[PDB]
Design a protein around this ligand. Structure first.
Ligand SMILES: Nc1nc2c(ncn2[C@@H]2O[C@H](COP(=O)(O)OP(=O)(O)O)[C@@H](O)[C@H]2O)c(=O)[nH]1
Ligand SMILES: [Mg+2]
Ligand SMILES: [Mg+2]
Ligand SMILES: [Mg+2]
Ligand SMILES: [Mg+2]
Ligand SMILES: [Mg+2]
Ligand SMILES: [Mg+2]
Ligand SMILES: [Mg+2]
Ligand SMILES: [Mg+2]
Lengths: 346, 208, 101, 110
RNA sequence: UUUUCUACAUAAGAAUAUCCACCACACGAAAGUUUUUAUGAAACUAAAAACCAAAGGAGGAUUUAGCAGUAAAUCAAGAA
């Protein structure tokens, strides 16, 4: 299959390749694990353009940046390829040189936190230095050119013995958040609210991607030593990224994704937004564009199999008759993640 | 055994039935088969006519199962075929064109070549004579030795890996090292053959 | 004549447990209540404690009716397994058959 | 007696019917979370719509601002029917089709 | 480690015996000690939390049981 750069309409079901340094600069953050192994194995970075990423990228070609922030939502079945249709947009709008703020799994902040720190600066809010520092260290390699460019306007107090005052580039505030991990989260939230204040300018086109948005409004697994559960509001991190989807600001576009796999207390088979997000989630999410992401059809399927034949990744001798195609089609119901899992051991 | 002796086994192979017309004694044979009113067994759920099943893979899978989990074993086998496959990719893309002609990226033929090579030729049985147990060299039938190889592989990789080391990784390692004969499995095979030789005289103790 | 002295004392335990039953229920009504004072409960305590302990429910023992066997009693027929089996095997017990499945 | 269970059951019937028509003080105290429906009135989606149209009016350099004008229009109506059919009817394809169409009209994208 | 946790039902996230001064944790407390609660006239019983986290690192001679929906593993029900 033939392609050049991200945007083409008649190139649906074709293989787009990128460099390794594109992979390192554009996604310093998480890339879906199975796709990361795909890349490390074939040594070529290849994706296939889908109709949902076409529809969404043609809604991000026409954006009017004077208009308030518009919210998009990517929904569908487990392993139907809706986390990567976020990656298409991410690297196309990183190639247009935007500010890419990317959180791979929101639930990671909601679930399984080793260290829960108590903060009364924010009025009874808890922070996760670990996640804050990892996310910041990825945000540093994400966009370098704009971190020397932004000028921070506030007076900021890290410690009784340390302060940074206005006129500072944001590379400095981010690396000062990374270096001292104690206050790293307050640095994250500050990076967020000042990103949103400075997005009014024509210097900032802000693409905000938070996968598993249902984690923001969802029920939390983390608990106090009292054994009492904490709400999604009680974290500094969630409380901050909740102001990042609010659509109060201009110059940006918020691309969102609702998840089952990463979720908590949600059943396995509900792929629809309103259930995952609940009353709080859908109600606070405001009018958004509800994009459906489904499994491959016959052309996308025979294209995926073409892709797996070219790399000789199907090592089964009988995978080369129409029998193999019929059986993998009958086995996966042509689901991309399922077809990945099924061509894993073959 | 809810079946009487009356119930003959299912022939699950599609290719035998699809192409009947060129064989006389076989037409006669499956005619005598279904004409006799033979009650025929319900075909097993584990076996499928799928072009992707290998009964060798099937039995190594089964032998790896613990408790009632077919799922956990099917998964560990998936991950082992996966580790072997991708690791062979990692050895292929770091190499030179000659070795890009040589290297095997098929985990299936690497598996069959890992068990065909690990299979001990003779094996010992204890015999009681004059109050002593002597280990005597015994010629073995194919299936027993198949079992021998598989069992040795499973036993070793269950046993000798460190606690952080996953099963499919370790089994990929030993599969690949058994392909080239240099893993501890063929060492057990070779100790089997050395002990088979030291005592070979006693083979006159064998009455069968 | 009841078949034993055992069945004698236990029968007297059934009569008695029927007699002071109302007293039991009404005293233990207050005694088991949280809202009421602890002070009415100490006095209610001395009260059910004062009752003859032969009139309390749990001092009663289920025995086989005819053979008096204290244990191995089938609740529905009030009959010891020896006697149950004996009766059912002669077919004198209705509906009871030998189980095959 | 069963006559008594019959008379007290039909009693429960009459009683529930007579006290179903009595509106009292605390029923005007009704929480909006208590609702069996999603009423488009006084909603959160309503204030999200009015803020999004406030910023559409502020970005377009249209100085026209009213609650009557913004809400009286056809598109906030398409949103009425869309989000009430989304909350009450639940999750469905034709319903998120109503959502995609009404918000397509509200945010101006075709 | 075919393990342990939480989600959960069968694609997930984290933990993982030695780093070292951990503010100890990986498994493994069914045992203890505290407080409750079930029943009962009477807690010596039973159940649930919190704490505590010990022996144990697949075990000598020698042996039990199983030929298919069996063994093994997981779950519930009833009898008193
Ligand atoms: N060829 C191709 N594969 C994809 C695409 N998107 C996703 N996949 C595959 O599907 C797998 C998982 O899908 P994911 O986006 O994580 O869906 P989710 O699990 O429901 O969130 C990845 O490992 C990819 O290999 C695509 O656009 N093209
Ligand atoms: Mg996902
Ligand atoms: Mg008793
Ligand atoms: Mg996992
Ligand atoms: Mg204990
Ligand atoms: Mg411990
Ligand atoms: Mg120890
Ligand atoms: Mg013996
Ligand atoms: Mg059993």
């Amino acid at each position: 299959x033939x392609x050049x750069x991200x945007x083409x309409x008649x190139x649906x079901x074709x293989x787009x390749x990128x460099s390794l340094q594109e992979l390192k600069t554009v996604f310093p953050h998480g890339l879906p694990p199975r796709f990361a192994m795909q890349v490390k194995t074939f040594n070529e970075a290849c994706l296939m353009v889908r109709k949902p990423a076409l529809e969404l990228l043609h809604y991000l070609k026409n954006t009017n940046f004077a208009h308030p922030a518009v919210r998009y939502v990517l929904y569908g079945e487990k392993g139907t390829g809706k986390t990567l249709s976020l990656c298409h947009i991410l690297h196309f709008c990183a190639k247009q040189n935007w500010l890419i703020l990317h959180i791979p799994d929101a639930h990671i902040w909601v679930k399984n936190c080793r260290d829960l720190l108590q903060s009364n600066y924010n009025k009874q809010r808890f922070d996760q230095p670990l996640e804050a520092s990892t996310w910041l260290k990825n945000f540093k390699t994400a966009n370098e050119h704009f971190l020397s460019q932004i000028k921070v306007q506030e007076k900021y107090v890290w410690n009784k013995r340390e302060s940074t005052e206005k006129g500072r580039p944001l590379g400095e505030v981010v690396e000062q958040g990374i270096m001292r991990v104690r206050n790293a989260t307050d640095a994250v939230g500050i990076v967020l609210k000042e990103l949103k204040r400075q997005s009014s300018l024509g210097i900032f086109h802000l693409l905000v991607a938070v996968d598993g948005v249902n984690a923001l409004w969802g029920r939390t697994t983390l608990k106090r030593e009292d054994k009492s559960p904490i709400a999604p509001e009680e974290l500094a991190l969630i409380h901050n990224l909740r102001k990042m989807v609010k659509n109060d600001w201009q110059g940006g576009a918020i691309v969102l994704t609702v998840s089952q796999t990463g979720s908590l207390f949600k059943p396995r088979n509900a792929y629809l937004p309103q259930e995952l997000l609940g009353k709080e989630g859908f109600d606070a999410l405001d009018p958004f564009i509800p994009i459906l992401v489904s499994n491959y059809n016959p052309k996308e399927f025979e294209s995926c199999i073409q892709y797996y034949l070219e790399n000789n990744w199907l090592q089964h001798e009988k995978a080369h008759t129409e029998e193999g195609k019929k059986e993998l089609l009958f086995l996966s119901n042509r689901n991309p993640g399922q077809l990945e899992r099924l061509c894993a051991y073959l | 055994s809810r079946y009487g002796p009356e119930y003959k086994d299912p022939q699950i192979d599609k290719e035998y039935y699809r192409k009947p017309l060129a064989e006389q004694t076989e037409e006669e044979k499956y005619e005598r088969d279904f004409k006799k009113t033979q009650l025929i067994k319900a075909a097993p759920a584990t076996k499928t006519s799928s072009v992707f099943e290998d009964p060798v893979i099937s039995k190594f899978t089964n032998m790896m199962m613990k408790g009632g989990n077919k799922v956990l074993a099917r998964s560990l086998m998936t991950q082992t075929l996966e580790a072997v496959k991708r690791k062979q990719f990692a050895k292929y893309h770091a190499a030179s064109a000659e070795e890009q002609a040589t290297i095997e990226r098929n985990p299936y033929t690497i598996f069959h070549q890992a068990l065909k090579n690990c299979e001990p030729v003779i094996g010992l049985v204890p015999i009681l004579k004059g109050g002593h147990f002597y280990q005597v060299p015994v010629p073995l039938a194919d299936r027993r030795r198949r079992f021998l190889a598989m069992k040795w592989m499973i036993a070793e990789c269950r046993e000798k890996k460190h606690r952080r080391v996953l099963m499919p990784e370790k089994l990929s390692q030993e599969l690949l090292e058994a392909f080239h004969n240099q893993g501890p499995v063929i060492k057990r095979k070779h100790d089997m053959h050395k002990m088979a030789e030291a005592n070979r005289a006693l083979a006159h103790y064998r009455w069968w | 004549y009841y078949v034993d002295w055992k069945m004698l004392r236990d029968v007297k335990r059934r009569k008695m447990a029927y007699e002071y039953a109302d007293e039991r229920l009404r005293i233990n009504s207050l005694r088991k209540n949280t809202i009421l004072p602890k002070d009415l409960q100490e006095v209610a305590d001395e009260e059910i404690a004062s009752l003859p302990r032969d009139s309390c429910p749990v001092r009663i023992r289920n025995r086989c009716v005819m053979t008096s066997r204290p244990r191995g009693v089938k609740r529905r027929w009030r009959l010891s397994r020896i006697v149950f089996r004996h009766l059912a095997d002669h077919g004198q017990l209705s509906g009871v058959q030998r189980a095959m499945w | 007696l069963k006559r008594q269970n019959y008379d007290y059951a039909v009693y429960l019937l009459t009683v529930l019917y007579h006290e179903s028509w009595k509106t009292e003080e605390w029923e005007k105290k009704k929480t909006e979370a208590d609702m069996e429906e999603y009423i488009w009135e006084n909603s959160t989606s309503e204030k999200n719509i009015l803020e999004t149209l406030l910023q559409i009016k502020a970005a377009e350099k249209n100085l026209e601002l009213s609650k009557e004008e913004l809400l009286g229009t056809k598109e906030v109506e398409d949103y009425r029917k869309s989000v009430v059919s989304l909350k009450n009817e639940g999750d469905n394809e034709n319903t998120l089709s109503q959502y995609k169409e009404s918000v397509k009209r509200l945010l101006n994208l075709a």
